[PDB]
């Protein structure tokens, strides 16, 4: 008997195009199609009504696009979607909500002084990162929270850029000021950026004191090595002498170490001083070396110029003393694994202070051959093949840096559960993808792999795949399969429409051995490089044959998308470096977009319905196969 | 405004005056203690006389600029609660700024604070309830 299927995003948005996927399986001829959406409580009115015809030429594959008007006729608002498949009818109730947009606030500097001017821009975008003309309110608040400046702007005809400037008086509250921006329509969402006012300070020259490592290891005989760097305000280096003294810190009491006072020559502008382990151990007159764990050290340095008598001071407080510096976590692993097929992990190793680690080997326990090296972002990607039974899989990861002992290495344990077969039929689908970062213009080969008994293999002739991006449904299609083949490769092009990580959901349906219907599905999450759809590059138009000289004219060249609006600002680079806490970068923008995805589970679910719901999809068929209704606007906490 | 000379003096200057008032208000918040009281100098003992003067000036500018009602209401409440004696006299603890049996000293301070409160009579009447009682006691 023919089976008719309907697929649509889990959450529908007002005033935005929404794609509905319609299918007929084992249906001859062509079938007319009419899809309508009504109010859930009573089906009083029609919000939209579209029609199409599914032809056997396209394998009964159809996609109908509709827009839900912002009528606001009724009130978690639901709408029922009813599709008439010839005589047959399939109905599914889907949640509805609206999103407003995003605001990005750019400030030239994060530390000002009383008297200077604050320059900030507001960028207005929608869910697709496109300029939009709305009305936005901008406020500036002092540390006490009293709005000192209030503005009401409209970005219409401004191409989504709003410039603003504020003049700091000579006598202002000193602390951490904030800027609040929100659309007038939806004041529930406020975007904030903060800066500091501070007080006028200007030393003779800059000195930076930092250790090579980010912590101290007790059993490290090399000691703690610190690199003192000095350079003038105009760029040239400093040659002089630096007096450095270390000191333990037991919570809030500084038991300064007298024997560790050293005098070092700063040549070329950089020095180096080592604290011996013996000195530190004898300073606290404690025979136990482990007793110093948790007692952070600090370094005080005093640089004295060789020409005159200029003196500046630097400090670096909070160098932890740790015996297990690295802590290990899982980030984007699925939780359900198809038994007997490879399982992909992902691991994140962080320093004691919470920063990502770098070149820390990781390895699963007991396999020893699945090693890797932690990358710049702290992510290490591994793969482990799974057992053929259906007992849960326990996987343990450990860092294997050589300096520490086995008992001091990080360790994290996770348990995964098998994918639930519909009728213990041992029918599975597997999607294998490259576990790296792609770029637009590259081509991705997805290997559809199928396992089942050699008695119903010939009854499957195709796979259907759907691509989810930014919550919306990107594209669908078919993968015709010649009978007898287990592995089928889909060559998939990657364009700028895939710039944030997309998701691929594939499935096949067949009649069961007993006589019922069967739907088997799998999904994968694929991450591609985060970059703008267009391009923007600033370089020097003039011939590069001279270092720039003060007061002279310089020519700049900006290359970008035609008709775009480019905005510039120049900063000292002394305040840019300390702005590492938060900068306006494309990665941050795409992360902000990625925080509003419909589905949150990485790549699998317990059942086929779990797979379809986790990816942010719904699937209803004329038979008794459907996915559970979702009512919450945010999935449970991780 | 109450004489309506802007048409010949120039309506374009009104916004400038408003900006000036806004800047002045932005500066004055530097002296606001966390206890909703204004001090003569930064981070020092709050002064009743200065708090009353600030309340009087703020109550005249709500109709011009967007004066925060929380600040003014908190200052009025602080004056009424923490500085008013049952007899009807406003106490002063910070060092004196103006010229002050203690007669002719409390009278001038009470008169000044009363003049200040009469400006914020219809402004913080909802956030501060016992204001009319304080005004009546001070007048008596
Ligand atoms: C929707 O159908 C149109 C027909 O022109 C096609 O271009 C588009 O790719 C289809 N989208 C999906 C998601 O199938």
Interchain CB contact of A144 with B (< 8 Å): yes
Which candidate from A150, A167, A173 shows the least CB-CB separation from B29? Answer: A173
Rounded-to-integer distance, Cα A552 and Cα A207, Å:
30
Contact between A166 and A154 under an 8 Å Cβ cutoff? The reply is no
Angstrom distance (rounded) from CA A278 to CA A218: 11
Q: Dig out the tokens for A589 from the structure.
A: 């923008």
Contacts of A454-459 with CB under 8 Å at 24 or more apart are A455/A513, A456/A510, A456/A511, A456/A513, A457/A483, A457/A484, A458/A483, A458/A484, A459/A510, A459/A511
Cα A539 from Cα A60, distance rounded (Å): 53
Protein residue whose Cα sits closest to atom 3 of ligand 1:
A63
B26 contacts on A by Cβ (under 8 Å): 148-149, 169, 172
Phi and psi at A430, nearest 5°, equal -135, 130
CA–CA distance, B135 with A477 (Å, rounded to integer): 80
CA distance A293 to A216: 9
* C-beta of A19 in contact with ligand 1 (< 6 A): yes
* Torsion, Cα of A18, A24, A28, A32 (10° steps): -30
Give backbone dihedrals phi and psi of B71, rounded to 5 degrees, phi first: -65, -50
**Structure tokens given for B114:** 């009363």
Beta-carbon contacts below 8 Å between A and B: 29
Residue A97 · residue A11 · CB < 8 Å: yes
A515's torsion region: left (phi>0), alpha (psi -120 to 50) or beta? left
The nearest CA of chain B is from the CA of A583 a distance in Å of 28
Method of determination used here: cryo-EM
Residue nearest to atom 4 of ligand 1 (CA): A63
Range A382-385 contact pairs with CB under 8 angstroms and sequence separation of 24 or more? A382/A344, A382/A345, A382/A346, A382/A347, A383/A342, A383/A343, A383/A344, A383/A345, A383/A435, A384/A342, A384/A343, A384/A345, A385/A341, A385/A342, A385/A343
Chain A residues with CB under 8 Å of B34 CB are 144
Stretch 146-165 of chain A: residues touching chain B, C-beta under 8 Å: 146-150
Rounded to an integer, what distance in angstroms lies between the CA atom of residue A396 and that of residue A472? Answer: 35
As a whole number of Å, the CA-based R_g of chain B is: 17
Task: Describe the strand order of the beta sheet including A336-337 as a list of residue ranges.
Answer: A336-337, A411-418, A393-399, A361-364, A372-373
* Runs of H (alpha helix) within A12-147: none
Contact A508, A460 (CB under 8 A): yes
DSSP letter for A55, please: -
Q: Which two tokens stand for residue A331?
A: 């980030």
Give the closest-approach CA distance of B40 to chain A in angstroms.
Answer: 14
Residues of A in contact with B30 (CB under 8 A): 171-173
Residues facing A159 on adjacent strands: none
What are the φ/ψ torsions at residue A117 (nearest 5 degrees)? -100, 135
């Amino acid at each position: 008997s023919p089976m008719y299927s309907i697929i649509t995003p889990n959450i529908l948005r007002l005033e935005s195009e929404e794609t509905m996927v319609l299918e007929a399986h084992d249906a001859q001829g062509d079938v007319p199609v009419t899809v309508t959406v009504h109010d859930f409580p009573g089906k009083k009115l029609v919000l939209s009504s579209e029609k199409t015809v599914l032809t056997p030429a396209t394998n009964h594959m159809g996609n109908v696009t509709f827009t839900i008007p912002a009528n606001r006729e009724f009130k978690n608002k639901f709408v029922t979607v009813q599709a008439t498949f010839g005589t047959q009818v399939v109905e599914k109730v889907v949640l509805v909500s609206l999103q407003s947009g995003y605001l990005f606030i750019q400030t030239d500097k994060t530390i000002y002084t009383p008297g200077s001017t604050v320059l900030y821009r507001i960028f207005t975008v929608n869910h697709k990162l496109l300029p939009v003309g709305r009305t936005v309110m901008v406020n500036i608040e002092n540390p006490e929270g009293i709005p000192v400046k209030q503005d009401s702007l409209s970005s219409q005809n401004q191409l989504g850029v709003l410039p603003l400037s504020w003049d700091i008086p000579e006598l202002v509250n000193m602390g951490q000021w904030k800027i609040r921006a929100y659309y007038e329509n939806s004041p529930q969402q406020v975007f904030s950026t903060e800066f500091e006012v501070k007080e006028y300070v200007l030393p003779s020259f800059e000195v930076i004191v930092e250790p090579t490592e980010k912590f101290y290891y007790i059993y490290n005989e090399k000691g703690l090595e610190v690199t003192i760097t000095a350079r003038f305000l105009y760029g040239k280096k400093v040659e002089g002498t630096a007096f450095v003294i270390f000191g333990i810190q037991d919570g809030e009491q500084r038991i300064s170490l007298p024997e560790s006072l050293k005098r070092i020559p700063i040549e070329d502008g950089s020095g180096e001083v080592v604290l011996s382990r013996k000195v530190l151990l004898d300073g606290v007159q404690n025979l136990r070396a482990e007793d110093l764990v948790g007692k952070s050290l600090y370094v005080s340095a005093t640089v004295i110029l060789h020409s005159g008598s200029d003196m500046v001071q630097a400090e670096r407080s909070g160098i932890p003393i740790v015996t297990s510096p690295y802590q290990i976590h899982f980030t984007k692993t699925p939780k359900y694994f198809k038994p007997g097929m490879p399982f992909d992990l992902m691991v994140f190793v962080t320093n004691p202070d919470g920063s990502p680690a770098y070149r820390v080997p990781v390895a699963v326990q007991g396999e020893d051959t699945v090693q890797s090296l932690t990358q710049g972002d702290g992510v290490a990607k591994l793969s482990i093949n799974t057992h053929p039974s259906q007992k849960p899989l326990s996987i343990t990861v450990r860092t294997k840096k050589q300096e520490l002992s086995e008992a001091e290495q990080a360790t994290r344990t996770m348990q995964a559960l098998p994918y639930s077969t519909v009728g213990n039929s041992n029918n599975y689908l597997h999607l294998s993808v490259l576990r790296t970062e792609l770029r637009p213009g590259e081509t991705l080969n997805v290997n559809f792999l199928l396992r089942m008994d050699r008695a119903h293999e010939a009854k499957i002739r195709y796979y259907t795949y759907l691509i989810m991006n930014k919550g919306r449904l990107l594209k669908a299609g078919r993968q015709v399969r010649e009978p007898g083949q287990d592995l089928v490769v889909l060559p998939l092009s990657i364009t700028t429409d895939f710039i944030p990580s997309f998701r691929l959901v594939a499935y096949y349906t067949l009649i069961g051995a007993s006589g019922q219907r069967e739907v088997v599905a799998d999904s994968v999450w694929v991450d591609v490089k985060d970059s703008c759809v267009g391009s923007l590059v600033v370089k020097s138009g003039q011939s590069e044959d001279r270092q720039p000289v003060p007061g002279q004219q310089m020519t700049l060249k900006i290359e970008g998308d035609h008709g775009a609006r480019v905005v510039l600002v120049a900063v000292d680079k002394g305040v840019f470096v300390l702005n590492k806490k938060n900068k306006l970068t494309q990665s941050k923008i795409w992360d902000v977009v990625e925080k509003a995805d419909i589905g949150c589970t990485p790549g699998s679910g317990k059942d086929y319905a779990g797979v379809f719901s986790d990816a942010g999809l719904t699937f209803t068929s004329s038979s008794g196969q459907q996915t559970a209704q979702r009512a919450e606007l945010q999935c449970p906490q991780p | 405004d109450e004489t309506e000379q802007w048409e010949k003096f120039g309506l374009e200057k009104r916004q400038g005056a408003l900006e000036l008032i806004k800047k002045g208000y932005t500066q004055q918040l530097a002296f606001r203690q966390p206890s909703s009281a204004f001090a003569a100098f930064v981070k020092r003992a709050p002064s009743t006389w200065l708090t009353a003067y600030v309340v009087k000036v703020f109550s005249l500018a709500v109709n011009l600029i967007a004066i925060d009602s929380q600040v003014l209401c908190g200052a009025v409440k602080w004056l009424i609660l923490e500085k008013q004696k049952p007899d009807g006299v406003f106490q002063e603890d910070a060092p004196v700024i103006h010229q002050e049996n203690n007669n002719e000293k409390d009278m001038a301070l009470t008169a000044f604070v009363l003049i200040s409160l009469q400006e914020a009579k219809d402004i913080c009447e909802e956030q501060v309830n016992s204001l009319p009682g304080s005004i009546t006691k001070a007048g008596d």
